[PDB]
Design a protein around this ligand. Structure first.
Ligand SMILES: NC(=O)c1ccc[n+]([C@@H]2O[C@H](COP(=O)([O-])OP(=O)(O)OC[C@H]3O[C@@H](n4cnc5c(N)ncnc54)[C@H](OP(=O)(O)O)[C@@H]3O)[C@@H](O)[C@H]2O)c1
Ligand SMILES: NC(=O)c1ccc[n+]([C@@H]2O[C@H](COP(=O)([O-])OP(=O)(O)OC[C@H]3O[C@@H](n4cnc5c(N)ncnc54)[C@H](OP(=O)(O)O)[C@@H]3O)[C@@H](O)[C@H]2O)c1
Ligand SMILES: [N+]
Lengths: 324, 324
């Protein structure tokens, strides 16, 4: 297992395919525009609204989801996670034909089988390691965003070449591709964002800010010491790992890192992470997410309002405004 | 208090002061170069070596530490924390006169009283929220790095104006200043790097990587899901807090953030952080750091060799090499 590049995309499987991109938001605009600049035959299927208008004004032949699917050989579904299933059953599935291919940028609905694509139709994935605006901008500047690719079912024998050529067309093969499975992409992706990148990180910052402000330290200073200075730390890790970061910080900071990291993130925290992982693997989290959507997003509603009221967010907004 | 800027620097207290920067590392070079371009009389004092004539070659009147201190009104000490004390006793303290001012960029040795400056000499601090190369670069490009300032003892009545004019001369007043105390800067700064930015963060990432690889996931994919994509997340928080970050990530990632963050970082984790803070406040951590240095850094030595052997660091180095 090592990374693949344009030279490893040995068949241009998107040649002569009509491509429908379903949705025209962050990913949809990026995938469609990069593919068009790479010379592919791209149309957009999306509901009426600002995405429909933005696609038309960008010069794309723009249809309903149903009509775009009917016209297409390759259909990439970039609606939001919780919308895809209902949109697939009503608008996409009736308009598929044998030998088509359906793509996704994240494996959630296919892996947990909220969507089942018929067995004479390929299912592939190109999952860029970045948001849509970055996927577009790096492409325009001559490189790209690395990506995973996978195939869930291969009816034609062309599903993997289609997946890799998709990655090449959106610029990902310029920087690096990694093959995976739908299962691993979904479970590792959900785990990483929950336990480390998004959940773990924000909860860690928040706990540190609370300890400081509850001990009597000024919150403005606390904002700088647990959040603002994180960017320079993570930039160093991104470029050169823990080694480069620990070379840059003072020796006191470095010694404190080694000594106090393990006091905060303990074996028990690791066990907490294992419980997070288990609820991803057993479908509990997936059902919880979709059930919250079916109920009108009541849990997400309370979470989003509670987050808006956080002291660190209020202090941070005022500081970021006082700082060009 | 909120941020102060160039308009809040009431007195150009460095006017006609002879300024010695002690050390010519990343910070020493940045501080001395910026102050020179701002118009101040800067000389360097450092041990012989490539620092000594890096400075020689950049046109700085360079001297011993003893002789540069003898000549200066303002002496800013930018040597590493564990070196400052022996350097101060042997080389700086005998060459101070009443009415001088001694500066630091971090409060550790003054706050914990490993160094005690005579009561007829001011002690101030300018602590940029950035490393040397960034303090120099941003100044060259027209702005700067924000900074804290503080005064530990004010003999002349000019110590705060000296501190704030030092901020101004290195470019920090162009973007924002926050007054603090030596005690708060030291304690909050040690706490942040230990519990959140450095210690907590690398420990969290490593715990996530361990959970994934021990559950049978390939380390290469795990590296992307707990480390590589953190830069994009932290960049978003830096620009717009949790709110902007959570708008850009998918809806499953955002829901997973709210649900699983608190399962990983629990009340017990917060208690662990409180114990970290207590050992900063009571001097235990500071004495442990200084004592490790006096014993020949045996704890730091074992930490560093263990870190070089981490699986995430080996995998990361290979993947970063495969990604220009
Ligand atoms: N966020 C990330 O960083 C990231 C990274 C990798 C993969 N992904 C995955 O990419 C997919 C999400 O794509 P995205 O980020 O581009 O989402 P998005 O920015 O929120 O855009 C969603 C698009 O789908 C449209 N849409 C919503 N409901 C629709 C419906 N019934 N019928 C037709 N169109 C509809 C929306 O149109 P309107 O404007 O009218 O609402 C919009 O154009 C998910 O699978 C996600 O897991 C996300
Ligand atoms: N790391 C950060 O991002 C950061 C941020 C804010 C504040 N600070 C504080 O900045 C201070 C450290 O400065 P720094 O980052 O510039 O460290 P540095 O890059 O390692 O520079 C150390 C300088 O001091 C010299 N030096 C070492 N021992 C000496 C001795 N006995 N006599 C004379 N000179 C000696 C070194 O010369 P040689 O090259 O010959 O060794 C070198 O020029 C600390 O107080 C730190 O807490 C650091
Ligand atoms: N220091």
């Amino acid at each position: 297992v090592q990374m693949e590049y344009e030279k490893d995309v040995k068949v241009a499987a998107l040649d002569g395919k009509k491509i429908a991109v379903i949705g025209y938001g962050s990913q949809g605009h990026a995938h469609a525009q990069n593919l068009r600049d790479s010379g592919r035959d791209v149309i957009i299927g999306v509901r009426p609204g600002k995405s429909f208008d933005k696609a038309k004004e960008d010069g794309f032949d723009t249809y309903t989801v149903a009509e775009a699917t009917k016209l297409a050989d390759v259909i990439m579904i970039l609606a939001p996670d919780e919308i895809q299933q209902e949109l697939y059953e009503a608008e996409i599935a009736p308009n598929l034909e044998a030998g088509n291919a359906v793509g996704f940028a994240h494996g959630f609905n296919i892996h947990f089988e909220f969507i089942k694509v018929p067995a004479d139709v390929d299912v592939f994935m190109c999952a860029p390691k970045g948001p849509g605006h970055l996927v577009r901008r790096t492409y325009e500047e001559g490189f790209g965003v690395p990506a995973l690719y996978a195939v869930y079912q291969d009816a034609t024998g062309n599903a993997k070449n289609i997946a890799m050529d998709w990655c090449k067309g959106v610029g990902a093969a310029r920087v690096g591709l990694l093959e995976t499975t739908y299962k691993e992409e979904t479970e590792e992706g959900l785990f990483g964002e929950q336990a480390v990148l998004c959940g773990g990180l924000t909860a860690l910052i928040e706990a540190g800010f609370e300890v400081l402000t509850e001990a009597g330290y000024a919150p403005e200073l606390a904002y700088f010491e647990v959040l603002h200075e994180m960017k320079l730390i993570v930039d160093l890790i991104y470029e050169g790992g823990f080694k480069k970061m620990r070379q840059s910080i003072s020796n006191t900071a470095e010694y404190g890192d080694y000594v106090s990291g393990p006091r905060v993130i303990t074996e028990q925290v690791k066990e907490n992470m294992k419980a997070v992982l288990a609820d991803i693997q057993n479908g509990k989290f997936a059902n919880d997410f979709v059930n919250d959507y079916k109920a009108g997003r009541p849990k997400l509603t309370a979470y989003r309002e509670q987050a808006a009221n956080l002291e660190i967010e209020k202090v941070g907004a005022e500081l970021r405004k006082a700082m060009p």
